[PDB]
Design a protein around this ligand. Structure first.
Ligand SMILES: Cc1cc2nc3c(=O)[nH]c(=O)nc-3n(C[C@H](O)[C@H](O)[C@H](O)COP(=O)(O)OP(=O)(O)OC[C@H]3O[C@@H](n4cnc5c(N)ncnc54)[C@H](O)[C@@H]3O)c2cc1C
Ligand code: SF4
Ligand code: SF4
Ligand code: SF4
Ligand code: SF4
Ligand code: SF4
Ligand code: FES
Lengths: 549, 411, 137
């Protein structure tokens, strides 16, 4: 057939979204090659990207559906397994309404599968009990940055920090995780850019920094409060910015004026505090790289120094999962439909109803991952898990196992036989990133294409196909979407932003950044261009008091 | 026609001759070899996307080489290591491969180390005056040329300037001016001196073609009997036209080659003294190499690194988990590669941490060369440590005029 | 506070014999060099020398048989070529190449072994502490 064919794809291992070539010989992925054309990484990959191809053709991959029949799983046909799932979901619905079910997907999955998953969870039985890894993962920082600015995403890109004078890494292992985001720090120091690292431990990304600052762990609020106190005290705040685009300054004033001497809390001497504070406030264009109160303090700093809406500046919280941003965008949260359209507002609730040809959408705040797992027997019973391994990921794994065994009809879709699989009643095999054909979304809001290299191992299918077949079994209208392009077009019709991100535009190696409202718009690589995304269009900066644990 | 002839060559097929960068002779020769069954496949470069994307391609259908026609100056890749990894080193199948000077040198390095079969491989070599990274070319065009890069149709380095053809006209800027401003050819391409691959089987270029054929003929130099046979077969079956080259063309070809040698020497100088001398060079090297995150891209991309397991992976040399890795990691590559480095730049350009691997390695290589007199990538000469000789060892000890190896070795 | 750390890698058949003969003849020299004793100097890999220098050897000495007197017919020609190349690498990484030398000591040259010991110690003392130990940090 084919000998050494190159297929361009996105790396599935973190939020940088590096591009790579998979080498496919006789329908087998046999290696990973650089793609020098990519703007994100210029053909450069970390160890994970270099060896992403190893797990694709493992013998352990699930090949056919499995059904727990009075013990060990026996081999089932697709029709059999799907009819079983449809029957059990139907009965649990008809007995316990929409509260009885529970959905959660992984951030490993492509945008089209996250969107169709949340569409399945809402168009059919109307439940907002949909969620994903981002809760239990490191950062609920999206909510905090949303409160500060309006969009919880990173304000600027990665190439953008090359334009600053004062990259300020803060508590980030940006070279251990996101190494090709830390490549920007390496390039910047080669260009001679002031770099200040502030992690509690001397990490390999703190080696690159001109100044390194220890502080006692769990004291970010105190340290940032001190820095803002000195900025206010010597008046290096940005008056036009604060008076024009920011609100809450008096509250910040009261809250911070109690942090003149905080050496007791954080270990940083007042001399070093003044040094970093004045370097940051004096830098004309300074970018913060972060990795709830902790992220709102960063928003406080950026708003206080007027470092937001411009090239070479901003706040860039690093995500960590390959498609966590994409899942949140597609609307795999309890409270947002898609593109962060809140379900609390009847306006877009009715817009969803009209677009999806369904009625009486829930509008109540769903149950997050831990909410579901804790109430996994009390009112929730019946659970579809799209790619999670909760027994290995959640803390108190034994409690997780107890709750899952308290559960009626778990369904698990995975590419491998995990530990959570033993507790499933049905196991639907899935496809990995080399067999899907969707899109990922980087941490810098960039939509990248994933391309099909090989076929799923045996009888395994990809998630859009599985969910469409299940919805056709259960009699649900609106899941007639045979391709990732059709799923994407349905999503685009639904969402106001991302309306310009057609696949003919995503076939560009550059990709598209998420606020792309029209088809001629080139994208929005820098957010909050001259107005924010809150009610008055003005960022709010809050006063946080440090709580000792 | 016989191993040393210098010819003008263009394709009989008008479409092949249009799509060739010059006369289409590389694409006519490759097509002929494939369809007359000298070779079982053809490894060439095609555009996968915009002309800034160069994708290697194994082609077995003779109908697909018209897609390979044209030269991509943003193709900074290296072919021979892909043939060893995913084509079993050409141990069972004949191939015909289009290659630049660095790609011919890499072929010879891997054949020295027994990793490919040059009896099976046919190397059609192209002249190379330099390659540009695709993304750097984009930034060049956006900033210095003041053009939207997606507008460009074709783009080439001709007469030492960067001609781009966009909608509206064409432009040109001296590559030396660009290279001073911080753009241009890759660093190793600036230092390169393998301009006409005379170690390949055929050397094709646009240098020395003068007069009525200045854009519709390829200057061919027949560098081996295998290439002579390929050319004679193509000319007889009528896929290729041959006229003897013009002596004035040969002369100015020699002059341009010599000038490119001098420019390469100048860049070698300014770069190697830019690295420093004494303990300053050790702080440059050590502080740069402290960035390495052990992605091993430099090892996997180097043509000379053919080892099943690198010694950089052995726990008695490098501690497995310590990430701010030792200088031993790069000392083990200086020791193993620097004697034969072909200055391909792959190690430098695939490094996520932007470490000047190629600059360090070539700075060591140039004077390992002027010490032992071994030029990498030219022929089947075994590596310096794979062939030690009694008389030569006596000679270097006597030349030091000393009873040991301590001093009077360098000037 | 500082004592030179010199490491020697001496072959078994001429340099170890020469050092043993010097000891037997009671030739005194300073106690600064510690030896490793491989069979031939052909065994000495480049990575041994580089590993020593990166661990912090202020000096490295490799001692073997004279040319034409290797126990294994030609194993010290290979070592000589390797050490010439090592001298070149250390000069181009900016470390002082006179921290390394290769001496040819026969089995009967105990006096010459003592003189080699003295001269290596003197040269390293002049050179001073190696820079790697502070460049690491
Ligand atoms: C990056 C680059 C720089 C060059 N610089 C010069 C120069 O300064 N002076 C000069 O006289 N000639 C240069 N050449 C060669 C020049 O294009 C030749 O005149 C041309 O190859 C003649 O062949 P043709 O037009 O007859 O056949 P063509 O139809 O052009 O055949 C060209 C062949 O080269 C292959 N190819 C294309 N891009 C690459 C690449 N990046 N790496 C390897 N193979 C590739 C194509 O697949 C095709 O088989 C350069 C070539 C490249 C690729
Ligand atoms: S930096 Fe992240 S996305 Fe890029 S190759 Fe490494 S793990 Fe994959
Ligand atoms: S290294 Fe030399 S031969 Fe290779 S592309 Fe650069 S200039 Fe051409
Ligand atoms: S490519 Fe660069 S980062 Fe990767 S191992 Fe080599 S030197 Fe280190
Ligand atoms: S060390 Fe780097 S420049 Fe030298 S041959 Fe290997 S890849 Fe090419
Ligand atoms: S560095 Fe040395 S051991 Fe490692 S792959 Fe290259 S040649 Fe082999
Ligand atoms: S036996 Fe001593 S050098 Fe070989």
């Amino acid at each position: 057939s084919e000998i050494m064919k190159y297929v361009a794809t996105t790396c599935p291992y973190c939020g940088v979204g590096c591009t790579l070539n998979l080498v496919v010989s006789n329908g087998k992925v046999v290696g990973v090659e650089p793609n020098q054309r990519s703007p994100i990484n210029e053909g450069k990959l970390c160890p994970k990207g270099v060896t992403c191809w190893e797990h694709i053709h493992s013998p352990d991959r699930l090949t056919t559906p499995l059904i727990k029949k009075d013990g060990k799983f026996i081999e089932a046909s697709w029709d059999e397994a799907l009819d079983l799932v449809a029957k059990n979901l139907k009965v649990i619905y008809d007995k316990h309404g929409p509260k009885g079910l529970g959905f959660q997907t992984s951030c490993r999955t492509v945008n089209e599968d996250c969107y169709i998953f949340q569409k399945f969870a809402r168009v059919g039985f109307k439940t907002n009990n949909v969620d994903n890894c981002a809760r239990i993962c490191h950062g609920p920082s999206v909510a905090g940055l949303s409160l500060s600015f309006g969009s919880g995403a990173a304000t600027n890109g990665f190439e953008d920090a090359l334009n600053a004078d004062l990259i300020l890494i803060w508590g980030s292992n940006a070279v251990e995780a996101h190494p090709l985001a830390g490549r920007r720090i390496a390039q910047a120091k080669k260009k001679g850019i002031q770099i200040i690292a502030v992690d509690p431990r001397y990490t390999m990304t703190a080696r690159l920094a001109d100044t390194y600052v220890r502080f006692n762990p769990s004291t970010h609020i105190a340290l940032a409060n001190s820095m803002m106190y000195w900025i206010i005290k010597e008046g290096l705040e940005d008056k036009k910015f604060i008076q024009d685009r920011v609100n809450g300054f008096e509250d910040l004033k009261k809250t911070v004026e109690n942090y003149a001497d905080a050496e007791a809390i954080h270990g940083v001497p007042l001399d070093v505090v003044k040094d970093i504070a004045f370097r940051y406030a004096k830098a004309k264009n300074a970018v913060i790289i972060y990795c709830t109160d902790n992220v709102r303090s960063m928003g406080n700093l950026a708003l206080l120094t007027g470092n937001v809406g411009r090239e070479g500046v901003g706040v860039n919280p690093l995500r960590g999962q390959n498609n966590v941003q994409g899942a949140c965008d597609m609307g795999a949260y309890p409270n947002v439909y898609s593109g962060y359209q809140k379900c609390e507002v009847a306006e877009n609730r009715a817009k969803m109803e009209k677009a999806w040809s369904v009625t009486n959408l829930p509008d109540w705040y769903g149950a997050t991952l831990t909410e579901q797992i804790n109430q996994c027997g009390d009112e929730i019973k019946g659970m579809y898990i799209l790619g999670l391994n909760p027994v290995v990921t959640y803390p108190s794994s034994n409690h997780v196992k107890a709750q899952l065994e308290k559960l009626d009809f778990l369904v698990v879709q995975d590419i491998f036989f995990t530990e959570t699989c033993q507790y499933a009643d049905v196991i639907l095999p899935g496809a990995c990133f080399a067999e899907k054909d969707g899109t990922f979304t980087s941490g810098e809001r960039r939509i990248n294409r994933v391309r099909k290299a090989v076929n799923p191992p045996g009888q395994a299918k990809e998630d859009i196909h599985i969910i469409s077949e299940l919805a056709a079994k259960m009699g649900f209208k609106g899941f007639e979407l045979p391709t990732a392009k059709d799923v994407w077009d349905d999503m685009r019709a639904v969402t106001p932003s991302m309306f310009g991100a057609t696949y003919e535009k995503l076939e560009r190696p550059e990709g598209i950044c998420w606020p792309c409202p029209t088809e001629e718009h080139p994208g929005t690589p820098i957010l909050h261009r001259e107005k924010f995304a809150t009610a008055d269009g003005k960022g709010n900066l809050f006063g946080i008091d440090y709580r000792p644990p | 026609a016989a191993k040393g002839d210098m010819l003008y060559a263009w394709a009989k097929d008008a479409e092949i001759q249009k799509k060739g960068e010059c006369g289409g002779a590389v694409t006519a020769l490759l097509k002929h070899a494939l369809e007359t069954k000298m070779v079982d496949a053809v490894v060439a470069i095609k555009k996968g996307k915009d002309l800034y994307d160069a994708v290697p391609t194994v082609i077995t259908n003779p109908e697909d080489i018209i897609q390979t026609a044209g030269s991509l100056h943003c193709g900074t890749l290296l072919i021979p290591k892909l043939i060893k990894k995913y084509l079993n080193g050409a141990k069972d199948m004949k191939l015909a491969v289009t290659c630049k000077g660095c790609d011919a040198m890499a072929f010879y390095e891997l054949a020295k180390r027994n990793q490919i079969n040059l009896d099976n491989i046919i190397m059609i070599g192209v002249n190379c005056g330099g390659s540009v990274s695709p993304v750097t070319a984009r930034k060049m065009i956006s900033n210095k040329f003041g053009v939207d890069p997606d507008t460009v149709h074709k783009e080439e380095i001709d007469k030492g300037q960067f001609i781009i053809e966009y909608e509206g006209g064409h432009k040109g800027i001296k590559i030396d001016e660009l290279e001073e401003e911080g753009y241009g050819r890759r660093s190793n391409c600036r230092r390169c001196k393998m301009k006409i691959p005379r170690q390949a089987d055929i050397a094709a270029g646009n240098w020395g073609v003068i007069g009525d054929k200045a854009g519709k003929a390829t200057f061919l130099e027949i560098c081996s009997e295998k290439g002579a046979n390929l050319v004679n077969s193509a000319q007889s079956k009528g896929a290729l036209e041959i006229s003897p080259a013009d002596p004035k063309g040969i002369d100015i070809r020699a002059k341009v080659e010599k000038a490119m040698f001098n420019l390469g020497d100048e860049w070698r100088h300014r770069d190697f003294e830019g690295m420093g001398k004494g303990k300053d060079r050790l702080k440059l090297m050590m502080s740069e190499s402290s960035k390495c995150i052990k992605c091993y891209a430099c090892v996997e991309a180097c043509p000379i690194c053919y080892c099943i397991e690198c010694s950089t992976k052995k726990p008695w040399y490098i501690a497995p988990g310590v990430l701010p890795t030792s200088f031993m990691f790069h000392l083990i590559r200086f020791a193993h590669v620097s004697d034969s480095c072909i200055n391909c730049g792959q190690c430098e350009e695939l490094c996520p941490m932007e470490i000047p691997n190629a600059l360090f390695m070539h700075s060591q290589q140039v004077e390992i060369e002027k010490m032992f007199g071994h030029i990498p990538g030219q022929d089947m000469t075994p590596p310096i440590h794979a062939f030690v000789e009694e008389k030569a060892e006596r000679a270097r000890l006597d030349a030091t005029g000393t009873d040991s190896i301590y001093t009077n070795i360098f000037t | 506070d500082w004592k030179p750390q010199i490491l020697a890698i001496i072959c078994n058949w001429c340099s170890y014999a020469g050092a043993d003969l010097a000891g037997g003849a009671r030739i005194q020299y300073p106690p600064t060099v510690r030896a490793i004793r491989v069979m031939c100097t052909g065994r000495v890999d480049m990575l041994f020398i580089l590993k020593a220098f990166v661990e912090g050897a202020d000096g490295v000495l490799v001692s073997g048989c004279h040319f034409g007197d290797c126990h294994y017919l030609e194993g010290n020609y290979k070592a000589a070529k390797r050490m010439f190349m090592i001298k070149n690498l250390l000069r181009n990484i900016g470390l002082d190449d006179r921290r390394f030398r290769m001496t040819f000591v026969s089995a009967s040259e105990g006096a010459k072994w003592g003189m080699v010991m003295e001269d290596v110690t003197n040269t390293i003392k002049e050179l001073g502490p190696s820079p790697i130990k502070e460049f690491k940090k």
